[PDB]
Design a protein around this ligand. Structure first.
Ligand code: GSH
Ligand code: CO
Length: 277
């Protein structure tokens, strides 16, 4: 009866991570990457400011949630965090826009080494990598969060059983000693996937203190947390916050780490809508 996965309607909501200079990142994402600034919220009582950016409204699209901590101008990215990706129908056009705007292209546009898909890489002001992926027409340009993991097979099993993700793609690249998987809730080219990368013989990475978590919406945080609890008893990872409403707000969430220590927050799909204004 973990056929709850089949009855839920989960959705990748946003990646949350920290930035040294909020205005600098906003300007880089709007001007270099063509994102929209969706919402900005200042929180003096707790000493931070958030900004939310993406390619459509947060009720239908995935977003980045940026956290600026007062008087903190840098973070450790760590070695485990891979990249965010942006799909675009002309990666040459986009890369040259980024260069024009004074952005950093670290990997010029061209087919992936060993494959055919045209990709490029940009580096943002804090050091976060953005892959650019040539793709004809997606409803979701902000289309990957890539994380490194120590055991690809353990992680695939974990995301399937804990989160109801489908394994969309698994690809071994022995010439370059890595293997990838993409997991998510719809066809890869229509959605935001989680891309997990294993490098041969590498079992550990630093989580840093820059990337915080990914948030995933669910029709019921209690049912979905039960599935997480079962998966963690078998496969590794740990519940952080048990399912329930947050103090005062009544917004229902649960949170956990995966077998490698990456954090995921489950948020009630309807409660999530309560801040999107
Ligand atoms: N060691 C790499 C392995 C993954 C990898 O190389 N992925 C491809 C895309 S699937 C890439 O970045 N290739 C570099 C290129 O084509 O220049 C990592 O951990 O990031
Ligand atoms: Co990627």
């Amino acid at each position: 009866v973990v056929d709850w996965h089949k009855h839920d309607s989960k959705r990748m909501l946003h990646a949350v991570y920290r930035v040294g200079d909020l205005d600098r990142t906003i300007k880089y994402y709007t001007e270099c990457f063509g994102m929209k600034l969706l919402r900005k919220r200042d929180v003096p009582d707790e000493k931070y400011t958030n900004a939310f950016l993406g390619f459509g409204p947060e009720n239908t699209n995935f977003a980045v949630e940026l956290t600026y901590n007062y008087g903190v101008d840098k973070y450790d990215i760590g070695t485990g965090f891979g990249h965010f990706a942006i799909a675009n129908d002309d990666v040459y056009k986009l890369a040259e826009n980024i260069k024009s705007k004074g952005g950093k292209i670290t990997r010029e546009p061209g087919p992936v080494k060993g494959g055919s898909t045209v990709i490029a890489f940009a580096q943002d002001p804090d050091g976060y990598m953005f892959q650019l992926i040539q793709r004809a027409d997606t409803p979701e340009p902000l289309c990957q969060v890539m994380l490194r993991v120590g055991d690809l097979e353990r992680s695939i099993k974990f995301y399937e059983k804990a989160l109801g993700m489908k394994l969309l793609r698994k690809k071994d690249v022995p010439d370059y000693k890595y293997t990838i998987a993409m997991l998510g809730y719809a066809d890869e080219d229509k959605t935001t996937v989680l891309e997990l990368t294993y490098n041969y013989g590498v079992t550990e990475y630093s989580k840093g203190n820059a990337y915080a978590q990914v948030a995933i919406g669910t029709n019921d945080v209690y049912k979905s947390a039960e599935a997480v609890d079962l998966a963690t008893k078998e496969l590794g990872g740990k519940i952080l916050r048990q399912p329930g409403p947050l103090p005062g707000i009544n917004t229902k969430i649960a949170s956990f780490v995966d077998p490698d220590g990456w954090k995921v927050v489950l948020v009630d799909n309807t409660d999530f809508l309560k801040e999107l204004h």
